[PDB]
Amino acid sequence: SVKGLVAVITGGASGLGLSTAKRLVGQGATAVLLDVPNSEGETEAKKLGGNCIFAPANVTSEKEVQAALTLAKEKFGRIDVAVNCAGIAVAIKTYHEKKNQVHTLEDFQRVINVNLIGTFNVIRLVAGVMGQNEPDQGGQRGVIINTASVAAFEGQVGQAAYSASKGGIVGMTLPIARDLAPIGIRVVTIAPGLFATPSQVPFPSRLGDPAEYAHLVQMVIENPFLNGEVIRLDGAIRMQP
Amino acid sequence: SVKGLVAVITGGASGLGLSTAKRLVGQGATAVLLDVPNSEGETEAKKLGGNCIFAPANVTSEKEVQAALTLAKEKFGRIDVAVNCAGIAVAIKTYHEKKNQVHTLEDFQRVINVNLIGTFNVIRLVAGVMGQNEPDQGGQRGVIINTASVAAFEGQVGQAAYSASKGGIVGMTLPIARDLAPIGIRVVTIAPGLFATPSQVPFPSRLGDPAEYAHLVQMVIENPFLNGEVIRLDGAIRMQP
Amino acid sequence: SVKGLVAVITGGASGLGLSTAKRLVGQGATAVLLDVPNSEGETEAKKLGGNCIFAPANVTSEKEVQAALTLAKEKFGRIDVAVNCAGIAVAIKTYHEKKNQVHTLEDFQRVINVNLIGTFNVIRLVAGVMGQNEPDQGGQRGVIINTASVAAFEGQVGQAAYSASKGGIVGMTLPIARDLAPIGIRVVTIAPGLFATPSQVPFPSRLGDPAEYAHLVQMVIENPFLNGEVIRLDGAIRMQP
Amino acid sequence: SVKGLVAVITGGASGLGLSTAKRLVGQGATAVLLDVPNSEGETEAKKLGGNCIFAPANVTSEKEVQAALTLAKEKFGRIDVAVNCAGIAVAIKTYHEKKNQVHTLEDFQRVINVNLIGTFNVIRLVAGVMGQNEPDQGGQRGVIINTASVAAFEGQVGQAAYSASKGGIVGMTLPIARDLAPIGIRVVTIAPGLFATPSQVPFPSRLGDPAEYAHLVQMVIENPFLNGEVIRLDGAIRMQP
Ligand SMILES: NC(=O)c1ccc[n+]([C@@H]2O[C@H](COP(=O)([O-])OP(=O)(O)OC[C@H]3O[C@@H](n4cnc5c(N)ncnc54)[C@H](O)[C@@H]3O)[C@@H](O)[C@H]2O)c1
Ligand SMILES: NC(=O)c1ccc[n+]([C@@H]2O[C@H](COP(=O)([O-])OP(=O)(O)OC[C@H]3O[C@@H](n4cnc5c(N)ncnc54)[C@H](O)[C@@H]3O)[C@@H](O)[C@H]2O)c1
Ligand SMILES: NC(=O)c1ccc[n+]([C@@H]2O[C@H](COP(=O)([O-])OP(=O)(O)OC[C@H]3O[C@@H](n4cnc5c(N)ncnc54)[C@H](O)[C@@H]3O)[C@@H](O)[C@H]2O)c1
Ligand SMILES: NC(=O)c1ccc[n+]([C@@H]2O[C@H](COP(=O)([O-])OP(=O)(O)OC[C@H]3O[C@@H](n4cnc5c(N)ncnc54)[C@H](O)[C@@H]3O)[C@@H](O)[C@H]2O)c1
């Protein structure tokens, strides 16, 4: 049961984060959608009812993230779960022979900044807020769930920046779970294959449905012994160049 | 929901398999406990009621496994789910200086035979039975779940035979999911850390509870996009020598 | 330098084991080719000269492997390096549609027996012989090198038996290095992609040359800090179903 | 043989990079040490003789890196090998409860900038220079070796920023090898355990010697089929929290 838990979901105005908010609110939880101001955040939070609110913030900004977390804790009293779905992608080769073009340093830095530095920024600030909760009967104070990708393991031609950012999330999953063990905060990462959001797959032979990602997030929230691990959700695909 | 599904659970008279049967029968499924004749399978199946029966069989025998699957079908009409939990262990070094003793070939063989060959024997025979089912709305005919171990990744001193056996389960998970993709049978492996069955864990700091392994099996049966993957269930532990 | 070292190479009459023997004998080492009686062992050993002999033995037999190691120690005085290249393969689906044929238990059993049980049998017996050597200046008494495959990570359709046998070699690499640490024996595993022995590779775009596997074996023998690890040698290929 | 090859080595004034330059120049290659102005680069380059020069540059600056690569090409004629060893480390928890301290965003950003963004900056600019070379007989134009760490797989308490930076190097290794396949440039990554540079390990039981990392670099340069892979060099250690 997720009934009564309070969750903050980055990238909550669209695709995987939105579908995660719809499932948890439908099971009795409260959700805060953290997304940029020009998104559809406000009207999705209105459609979802009085137990879902919108908080505008860019995940690379310390000040905007801090204000969104303060808002959640005042509206709902505490924070129990955080899910990181905010992210961007590009498709640019390291070096393109035919156009004789070199990947810019600025396009690499931008993808690292939103995807990897932005996910650590949310984790570092939300951990101190969860630390304020009273431990449940098993010593737990919170759960943090991150979104990597199968490109951390089989990155394709044109994915060097994206793959570097997602491999960085995979790499920090264990040390962050070991750091937060003493205060009872579990840290788990999901790595999606190809999903239908804004025939290579063995079975089922189709794009993933965002509601299948949401079901896996609920399982992770409910199981108390899952921690410091990365789980592939991809219909058994292995990516080719 | 697992309501109305039919599941065969090897090693179902004790520990992880028994706890899995309790959970699935309590959610409305039917369960067949496949375990050795001298186990307590019969009285555990009686305690769970009319939707749980016992089928005595050794997983290394072709004839006994076939007769157990024929019984399940005769009684319940079909097979939807199979869970492999039957397994044994030894603690013997490859070579022990102190007593000048080499590990015997016979003790390695026995562990491989029960753990790895017995798991493939159940997989090959149950696939033909699941292949008889009409596909659901998503093209699925069944789900097979195996039990490996964190020893497939950090085997300790004395675990060479056990690690070989569980490393073989990990290695065959993807080729078996690729083989059974055309008929809609998913194949997923769970790798448990230390569990309380017949100080080192980061969080929670205790042995796992068998009911936590059962909850993970139920969520693997429910999520349609999880396939060809291995999932660690271990409290974030990493084993030392 | 491998000059003067004594090596036993299983599967030495052909392909990767033969090419390994040619390189090491070329650099001043002595080699013993362990392979079945019906192979070309004897004439390859004669072509390579007086520092290369043939010892007929099936790796699944305790008695014949023991006799081959006794011959090597008798003839050359000691054993410093062991290389496991003996192996077989099959292409059989777990359950085959068009012919309605289930994978036999006997075909799975035979691949496991030669590839995984036969590699452990050589390891266990050669460790005691290496243990007889006086330690060098860095405390080392020997080095054991095994041959797995990229099929341990991306097994294809029809590779379930082979993948299981090679995943078991990967799984036991670390516990066996941990077991043999106290007497100074290093244990490393190589995982080849596709080699030219009896267009999908990124670069170089061709099958591997057996002489490239032999160069990597020499590098492993010479580097003192490489231990308990698996190395892919494959042109950056990742296998599709 | 590396005789005649021209290598650019970042972080070449100290530790792993310096030992690598010593070995390669000793075998007849030419080396360019790329390191910061405050280092001892100039006097190490002078001690090694006329086939070793110093080029002051910060890897985070594309103007300084471009000027260093231009100096190497004009002085020696071409660039055949690039080794990335430049790197820094910090030991700071994500959150510390007793002192109520949150990891700063700036300290995480700094480590990502030098270790991950600086390595991609060197890779993107050196690739175009290697592309100018005439392909050898096997179609190769160059080789790029990166330095990650065992902290990409077992990060400890306090290593969240360092682990994220090294996990990013691991994750981009395959997409960069796939990108550069068409022009014959191999891309491989080494992951060192604990080394004696400016108790525990199974065997040998000691810190690694920088000369052992240099020997592995040479073998990666000489083997033509090693590509898109990560190799652990750590005495079989597995890191605890
Ligand atoms: N759809 C797929 O196939 C897929 C596959 C693998 C991984 N992913 C990952 O899943 C996550 C969700 O992606 P999605 O498919 O739902 O995409 P999406 O575009 O539909 O949703 C991502 C949301 O993140 C928000 N966002 C972007 N930059 C932000 C910033 N700086 N601050 C705050 N919000 C920001 C966007 O505005 C958007 O609403 C991402 O991390 C993505 O990399 C998606
Ligand atoms: N408990 C742990 O810490 C742990 C950790 C990792 C992996 N595992 C694995 O979990 C699985 C279940 O283990 P467990 O802890 O419940 O042990 P358990 O002893 O309680 O149960 C295992 C059951 O398997 C049955 N079994 C054994 N050999 C059999 C055979 N040849 N044919 C049929 N049934 C047979 C036994 O009779 C027993 O009832 C095993 O595969 C074990 O290797 C357990
Ligand atoms: N060639 C490839 O593409 C490739 C790729 C990956 C892994 N491998 C592995 O490389 C190893 C060598 O294979 P190869 O390509 O050189 O094949 P090969 O057929 O040319 O040589 C293998 C040798 O092992 C011997 N052998 C077989 N069964 C034996 C037994 N019971 N006892 C003793 N010797 C026995 C054979 O007689 C043969 O001489 C095998 O383990 C194989 O699985 C090969
Ligand atoms: N020593 C170990 O135990 C160890 C273990 C794992 C990985 N590593 C990695 O090995 C590599 C070599 O480290 P080391 O142990 O030899 O350390 P070191 O400090 O001895 O040498 C690294 C060098 O990098 C240079 N450097 C730092 N920042 C730079 C920048 N912005 N631009 C250019 N040069 C810069 C420094 O001036 C120094 O000379 C690093 O990437 C490190 O993370 C080391």
Q: Which of D150, D162, D190, D191 is catalytic?
A: D162
Q: What are phi and psi of C10, to 5 degrees?
A: -75, 150
Q: What are phi and psi of A105, to 5 degrees?
A: -75, -30
List the one residue out of D146, D24, D193 whose CA is nearest residue C225: D193
Would you call C163 an interface residue with chain B, using a CB distance cutoff of 8 Å?
A: yes
Note the ligand closest to the C-alpha atom of D8.
Answer: 4
Helices and strands in chain C, H and E counts: 8, 9
Note the ligand closest to the C-alpha atom of C163.
Answer: 3
Other CB atoms within 10 Å distance of the CB of residue D219: 18
Instruction: Name the closest residue on chain C to residue A203, using Cα atoms.
Output: C241
* Contact residues for D56 (Cβ-Cβ < 8 A; gap 6+): D35, D36, D37, D41, D64, D68
Note the ligand closest to the C-alpha atom of D159.
Answer: 4
Query: Which region, left, alpha or beta, applies to residue C179 given φ > 0 means left and ψ of -120 to 50 means alpha?
Result: alpha
Q: How far is the CA of A183 from the centre of ligand 1 (A)?
A: 29
Whose alpha carbon is nearest atom 2 of ligand 1?
A195
Tokens read off for D115? 């270790």
Distance CA A144, CA A180 (A): 10
- Does residue A111's CB lie within 6 angstroms of at least one atom of ligand 1? no
* Contact residues for B208 (Cβ-Cβ < 8 A; gap 6+): A225, B192, B193, B194, B195, B196, B233, B234, B235
**Helices C210-222 and D210-222, axial angle in degrees (round to 10):** 170
- Does residue A88's CB lie within 6 angstroms of at least one atom of ligand 1? yes
To test the ligand 2 pocket, which listed residue (B60, B110, B149) has its Cβ within 8 A of the most ligand atoms? B149
D227 closest CB neighbour out of C138, C202, C222: C202
Q: Are A192 and A216 in contact (CB under 8 A)?
A: no
Q: How far is the CA of B85 from the centre of ligand 2 (A)?
A: 6
**Which ligand 1 atom is at minimum distance from the Cα of A89?**
43
Instruction: Name the closest residue on chain B to residue C113, using Cα atoms.
Output: B109
Best mutation site among A59, A90, A117, A176 for testing chain D: the one with the most D CBs within 10 Å?
A176
Q: Name residues contacting ligand 2 (CB within 6 A).
A: B 10-11, 13-17, 35-36, 39, 58-60, 85-88, 114, 118, 147, 149, 192, 194-195, 197-198
Instruction: Inspect the interface and report whether the beta carbons of A225 and B202 lie closer than 8 Å.
Output: no
What are the angstrom distances between the C-alpha of D16 and each of A4, C227, D217? 54, 19, 10
- D130's enclosing H/E stretch is helix D118-130
Domain count, chain B: 1
Would you call D157 an interface residue with chain A, using a CB distance cutoff of 8 Å?
A: yes
Q: Are D24 and D33 in contact (CB under 8 A)?
A: no
Instruction: Inspect the interface and report whether the beta carbons of C131 and B166 lie closer than 8 Å.
Output: no
Whose alpha carbon is nearest atom 26 of ligand 2?
B86
B95 closest CB neighbour out of C112, C158, C179: C179
Q: Which of A76, A108, A162, A213 is catalytic?
A: A162
Q: What is the SS3 assignment for C20? A: helix
Would you call C238 an interface residue with chain A, using a CB distance cutoff of 8 Å?
A: yes
Question: Which method, experimentally, gave rise to this model?
Answer: X-ray
Place of tokens 């990493």: B238
Tokens read off for A119? 């996910």
Q: How far is the CA of C152 from the centre of ligand 4 (A)?
A: 34
C95 closest CB neighbour out of B97, B131, B178: B131
Q: What is the 3-state secondary structure (H, E, C) of chain B?
A: CCCCCEEEEECCCCHHHHHHHHHHHHCCCEEEEEECCCCCHHHHHHHCCCCEEEEECCCCCHHHHHHHHHHHHHHHCCCCEEEECCCCCCCCCCEEHHHCEECCHHHHHHHHHHHHHHHHHHHHHHHHHHHCCCCCCCCCCEEEEEECCCHHHHCCCCCHHHHHHHHHHHHHHHHHHHHCCCCCEEEEEEEECCECCCCCCCCCCCCECHHHHHHHHHHHHHCCCCCCCEEEECCCCCCCC
Between CA D143 and CA D151, with CA D145 as vertex, the angle to 5 degrees is 160
Q: Name residues contacting ligand 4 (CB within 6 A).
A: D 10-11, 13-16, 35-36, 39, 58-60, 85-88, 114, 118, 147, 149, 192, 194-195, 197-198
Best mutation site among A94, A117, A121, A153 for testing chain D: the one with the most D CBs within 10 Å?
A94
In chain C, what residues touch A154 (CB-CB under 8 Å)?
238
Instruction: Inspect the interface and report whether the beta carbons of B154 and D202 lie closer than 8 Å.
Output: no
CATH number of the CATH domain containing D19: 3.40.50.720
In chain B, what residues touch A203 (CB-CB under 8 Å)?
139, 177, 180-182, 184, 186, 227
Q: What are phi and psi of C16, to 5 degrees?
A: -65, -40
CA distance B209 to chain A (A): 8
Q: What is the SS3 assignment for D185? A: strand
Note the ligand closest to the C-alpha atom of B85.
Answer: 2
Would you call D174 an interface residue with chain A, using a CB distance cutoff of 8 Å?
A: yes
Q: How far is the CA of A36 from the centre of ligand 1 (A)?
A: 11
Tokens read off for B194? 């230390």
C241 closest CB neighbour out of A154, A202, A241: A202
**Burial status of residue B146 (CB atoms within 10 A of its CB: 0-12, 13-18, 19 or more):** buried
What are the angstrom distances between the C-alpha of A196 and each of A16, A161, A176, A208, A212? 9, 22, 30, 6, 11
**Helices D118-130 and D62-76, axial angle in degrees (round to 10):** 30
> What range defines the domain where residue A100 resides?
1-241
**Burial status of residue D231 (CB atoms within 10 A of its CB: 0-12, 13-18, 19 or more):** buried
Place of tokens 């079908």: B73
* Contact residues for D92 (Cβ-Cβ < 8 A; gap 6+): D103, D107, D158, D160, D161
Other CB atoms within 10 Å distance of the CB of residue B56: 18
In chain A, what residues touch C239 (CB-CB under 8 Å)?
238
Would you call A238 an interface residue with chain C, using a CB distance cutoff of 8 Å?
A: yes
**Which ligand 3 atom is at minimum distance from the Cα of C58?**
32
Relative to beta strand C95-96, strand C101-102 is antiparallel
Distance CA B6, CA B50 (A): 13
* Contact residues for B40 (Cβ-Cβ < 8 A; gap 6+): B13, B14
